[PDB]
From Swiss-Prot, chain A:
Name by which UniProt lists this protein: DNA replication licensing factor MCM6
Compartment list: Nucleus; Chromosome
Known function: Acts as a component of the MCM2-7 complex (MCM complex) which is the replicative helicase essential for 'once per cell cycle' DNA replication initiation and elongation in eukaryotic cells. Core component of CDC45-MCM-GINS (CMG) helicase, the molecular machine that unwinds template DNA during replication, and around which the replisome is built.
Modification sites for Phosphothreonine: 122
From Swiss-Prot, chain B:
GO-annotated biological processes: DNA replication; DNA replication initiation; regulation of DNA replication
Subunit structure: Component of ORC, a complex composed of at least 6 subunits: ORC1, ORC2, ORC3, ORC4, ORC5 and ORC6. ORC is regulated in a cell-cycle dependent manner. It is sequentially assembled at the exit from anaphase of mitosis and disassembled as cells enter S phase.
The protein's name: Origin recognition complex subunit 5
Gene that produces this protein: ORC5
Predominant cellular place of this UniProt entry's protein: nucleus
Residues annotated to bind ATP: 31-38
Tissue-by-tissue expression: Abundant in spleen, ovary, prostate, testis, and colon mucosa.
UniProtKB/Swiss-Prot annotation, chain C:
Name by which UniProt lists this protein: Origin recognition complex subunit 4
SUPFAM superfamilies to which the protein is assigned, alphabetical: P-loop containing nucleoside triphosphate hydrolases
Keywords for this protein: ATP-binding, Disease variant, DNA replication, DNA-binding, Dwarfism, Methylation, Nucleotide-binding, Nucleus
Chief subcellular location: nucleus
Compartments reported by the entry: Nucleus
Protein source organism: Homo sapiens (Human)
A Pfam family recorded for this sequence: ORC4_C
One Gene Ontology CC term in the entry: nucleoplasm
Length: 134, 364, 406
């Protein structure tokens, strides 16, 4: 009900106060939307095959799908280069960079050949989004 | 020709050996629907040029038909009519003595064998041990979709050699689909077509026949943009919505006035427990009479019990919308069941301007 | 070279596939001695006897009779006076057909007559002939056991000598007979059991794959005998033999395994290898259910996992299509935006296909009154089987695997 809307506003304001920001930004809204949605929650998500967490897997999938869908209105190497450009704010060492390259290569391959969300079109194959992913 | 089928062919050829050699009395081959059991064995038999009789169990729904067809085809390979299995054995022994049938193995291919267990009790055991009884260098093959575990009789019989046809994969399916490319365009064009089609539909439809049928249907729309004037992006953008519309249907390929009220009343009677009926219809606080009372309550106008409403009831029963439960002779206490989907009843209520959800006890 | 390989292939195929007679007999000395002695008594004199032989299927029941007949018929001119009749429970299912076969084999249709007349006193009044009865148990299920009673009566009568031999796999053949025939049945029973140890099984395997002394090439035969002798003590071959001996002691399975092993014998490999026997044993011992599950698709796997969850939550209770559909919808809705947007008809078709493959069976079958929907279904699989099959699935997605684990 409207009470949940007021709670959402309160949560956004709390996020804004946490970051010492005089104005509220949509990032806080996106953050609070998950917390309001989750409800039933496990202790810990299991690992996914070097292992990676389910939340990070979903985050990478969402980012790559959003970028490809935005560009729709690409190439494998170009997309990897974009991702590494976007994540430069977190990597601080060469080892972390090579780890990130390994992870993104593995994730793109896994999406291409297991989850079928990414479709290959014919060393630099074209990648397209399966038209039934929202 | 056969593609991605080389292990099984080699195994069968090794099993056969030479013409004068003997083989197993019974081989039971099982696999999936699109494994190609009929294609591979028939092509192999044609290539090796062996005396073989091909039989469909479904066509021979009676024992006499089966035996007569087998005997007639075998004679044509070299009129005869038989009635009992022993007579069939004797006539088979008589007919197998031909010079062309002297030192050669005789093969009886049976397909769709799943019905054999429903024909006769002793027919399957007799067919299993045919080589012992005839003693005339005879081999019998089985093709089926059910595992051998369910074909075992209670008394137990001569165990056939069991064989499995491997399931298909992405590469095998792509190769098979790309073999029969149309001559009017490049092979790589059809390969890309097969690639995108598999990337779209492999999740659900793995049937080779079905996927090939879909490709045949959808190719003309695939080839339009280039005719209109190797542009992968252009073709994909032009073609995606049509593929989505096609995927909407993978395996699929106005009542009278009072009839609508009868149908909705029947649905209410079926899916609403009797205890709550008055709670929904009595102004103050399944058998035919309950249906009549509910109909009288729902309709705002006074409806006379003309025979035409009973004719409507019987017509609805005939149209397989309402199922009769009780005995047909008992036409004073009849029982009915409603078999209409909920979406259909909601649509008809919308066309009637009636809100059925307000009366459904389960939803409340 | 090639000709020798072809000849040995023919000989071994005849030995295994057709079960041609062989002088070698294993652990059946006393039984065969008794049976041959009694056959000689029944042939050289006018005395009558009735015997039943009980054993598991494939234990060489027919071999004893065939060897005894080939041993004793050619002794003297008694074979001229002796007549043999063979009746099988599978071919003759009715007493009329049995009477027709008896008349035709005895070549008395000219004496008796050609028409379908039910009178049989032509033979009965006229009635040394031996009878062999394969699948003796089936005759006991006839309406009145008339044929068995008449055979026992003429055996006990003082008109003509008749010897009756029966074969049975059931151990309770005595209780399937009526009191009268049981009283008139001479309680003569022979039991055929595989009463021998594992070393004797190894000796049987070594002897069975041994070339006979009548083969043309002698040095090749000696080399073959040395090769099989060497392969006898190889621990992989002994492991395979131990596995099959634990499974079943029947010689028919051993013959089948040896035939399959010999199938992989070519010119480049004239002599077998332990790896060949390992391959044959692996080929003979694979489960069909796991293969069938492996041959499925993604949607069927999801439906099966939902079915397993239903069986776990509701302990040993049936189910229908609607509950499975509802919980599949729950699974696809909890996940944010996974690509599983399917409508009702396609899932219904998948369920129909699953029922067609006979992994799911209805209870108290009826049609018309109940649709395919709202029908009580049950699963015919075990949880460990599903887990093992899912482990070997080629391209199982992560989401469905974790849902299965949950
Ligand atoms: N391995 C294969 N190589 C080439 N063509 C194949 C192969 N498998 C199947 N096909 C083709 O697919 C067609 C349909 O396969 P089927 O032979 O009907 O499959 P099936 O295993 O016989 O299943 P049933 O018994 O007919 S329901 C065949 O007529 C072939 O043209
Ligand atoms: N004691 C034995 N000595 C030699 N060979 C044996 C012995 N017992 C069984 N066998 C062999 O086992 C194989 C299978 O026996 P079968 O003849 O098929 O059984 P069976 O006698 O026909 O019994 P049923 O019930 O009629 S199938 C044959 O090749 C026999 O030679
Ligand atoms: Mg077929
Ligand atoms: Mg036998």
């Amino acid at each position: 009900t409207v009470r949940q809307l007021e709670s959402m506003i309160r949560l956004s304001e709390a996020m804004a106060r946490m970051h010492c920001c005089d104005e509220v930004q949509p990032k806080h809204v996106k953050e609070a939307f998950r917390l309001l949605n989750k409800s039933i929650i496990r202790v810990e998500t299991p690992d996914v095959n070097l292992r990676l967490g389910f939340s990070e897997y979903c985050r990478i999938s969402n980012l790559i799908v959003l970028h490809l869908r935005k560009v729709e209105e690409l190439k494998r190497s170009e997309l990897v280069n974009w991702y590494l450009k976007e994540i430069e704010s977190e990597i601080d060492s060469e080892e972390e960079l090579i780890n990130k390259k390994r992870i993104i290569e593995k994730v793109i391959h896994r999406l291409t050949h297991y989850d079928h969300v990414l479709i290959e079109l014919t060393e630099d194959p074209y990648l397209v989004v399966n038209p039934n992913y929202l | 020709v056969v593609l991605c089928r080389e292990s099984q062919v080699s195994i069968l050829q090794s099993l056969f050996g030479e013409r004068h050699h003997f083989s197993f009395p019974s081989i039971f081959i099982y696999g999936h629907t699109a494994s190609g059991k009929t294609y591979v064995t028939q092509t192999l038999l044609k290539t090796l040029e062996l005396p073989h009789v091909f039989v469909n169990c479904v066509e021979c729904f009676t024992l006499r038909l089966l035996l007569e067809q087998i005997l007639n085809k075998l004679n044509h390979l070299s009129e005869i009519t038989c009635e009992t299995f022993n007579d069939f054995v004797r006539l088979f022994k008589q007919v197998t003595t031909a010079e062309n049938l002297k030192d050669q193995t005789v093969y009886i291919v049976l397909d769709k064998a799943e019905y054999l267990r429903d024909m006769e009790a002793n027919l399957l055991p007799g067919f299993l041990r045919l080589q012992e009884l005839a003693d005339r260098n005879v081999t019998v093959l089985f093709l089926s979709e059910i595992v051998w575990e369910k074909f075992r009789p209670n008394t137990g019989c001569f165990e056939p050699f069991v064989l499995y046809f491997p399931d298909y994969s992405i590469g095998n399916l792509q190769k098979i689909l790309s073999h029969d490319h149309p001559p009017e365009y490049s092979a790589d064009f059809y390969a890309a077509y097969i690639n995108i089609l598999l990337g779209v539909f492999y999740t659900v439809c793995r049937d080779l026949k079905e996927l090939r049928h879909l490709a045949v249907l959808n190719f003309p729309k695939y080839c339009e943009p280039v005719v209109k004037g190797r542009d992968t992006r252009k073709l994909w953008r032009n073609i995606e919505p049509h593929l989505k519309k096609a995927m909407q249907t993978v395996y699929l390929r106005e009542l009278p006035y009072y009839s609508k009220f009868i149908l909705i009343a029947a649905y209410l009677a079926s899916y609403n427990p009797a205890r709550t009926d008055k709670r929904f219809f009595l102004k103050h606080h399944f058998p035919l009479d309950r249906l009549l009372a509910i109909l009288y309550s729902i309709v705002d106008s006074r409806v006379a019990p003309t025979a035409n409403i009973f004719s409507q009831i019987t017509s609805l029963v005939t149209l397989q919308l309402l199922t009769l439960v009780g005995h047909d002779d008992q036409l004073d206490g009849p029982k009915y069941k409603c078999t209409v989907s909920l979406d259909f009843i909601r649509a008809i209520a919308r066309t009637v301007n009636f809100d059925i959800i307000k009366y459904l006890y389960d939803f409340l | 070279h090639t000709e020798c390989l072809s000849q040995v292939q023919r000989i071994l195929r005849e030995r295994f596939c057709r079960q041609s007679p062989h002088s070698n007999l294993f652990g059946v000395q006393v039984q065969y001695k008794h049976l041959s002695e009694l056959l000689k008594r029944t042939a050289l004199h006018g005395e009558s006897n009735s015997v039943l032989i009980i054993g598991p299927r494939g234990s060489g029941k027919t071999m004893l009779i065939n060897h005894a007949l080939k041993e004793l018929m050619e002794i003297e001119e008694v074979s001229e006076n002796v007549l043999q009749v063979h009746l099988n429970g599978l071919l003759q299912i009715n007493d009329k057909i049995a009477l027709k076969e008896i008349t035709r084999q005895l070549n008395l249709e000219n004496v008796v007559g050609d028409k379908v007349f039910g009178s049989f006193a032509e033979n009965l009044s006229f009635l040394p002939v031996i009878f062999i009865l394969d699948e003796f148990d089936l005759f006991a299920h006839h309406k009145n056991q008339t044929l068995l009673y008449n055979l026992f009566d003429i055996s006990q009568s003082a008109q003509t000598p008749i010897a009756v031999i029966g074969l049975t796999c059931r151990l309770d053949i005595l209780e399937l007979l009526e009191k009268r025939v049981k009283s008139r049945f001479s309680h003569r029973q022979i039991h055929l059991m595989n009463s021998f140890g594992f070393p004797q099984y190894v000796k049987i395997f070594k002897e069975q794959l041994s070339l006979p002394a009548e083969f043309p090439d002698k040095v090749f035969a000696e080399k073959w005998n040395e090769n099989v002798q060497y392969l006898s003590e190889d621990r992989s071959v002994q492991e395979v033999l131990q596995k099959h001996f634990n499974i079943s002691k029947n010689l028919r399975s051993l013959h089948m395994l040896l035939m399959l092993a010999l199938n992989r014998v070519t010119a480049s490999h004239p002599f077998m290898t332990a790896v060949d026997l390992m391959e044959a044993s692996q080929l003979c011992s694979m489960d069909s259910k796991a293969n069938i599950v492996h041959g499925l698709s993604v949607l069927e796997i999801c439906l099966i996992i939902a079915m397993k969850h239903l069986n776990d939550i509701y302990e040993e209770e049936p189910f229908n299509f609607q509950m499975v559909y509802n919980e599949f919808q729950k699974f696809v809705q909890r996940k944010a935006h996974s690509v599983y947007n399917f409508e009702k008809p396609v899932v219904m078709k998948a369920f129909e296909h699953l029922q067609q493959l006979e992994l799911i069976k209805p209870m108290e079958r009826t049609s018309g009154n109940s649709q395919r929907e709202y029908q009580l279904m049950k699963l015919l699989l075990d949880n460990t089987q599903i887990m093992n099959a899912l482990q070997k699935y080629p391209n199982c997605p992560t989401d469905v695997r974790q849902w299965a684990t949950s």
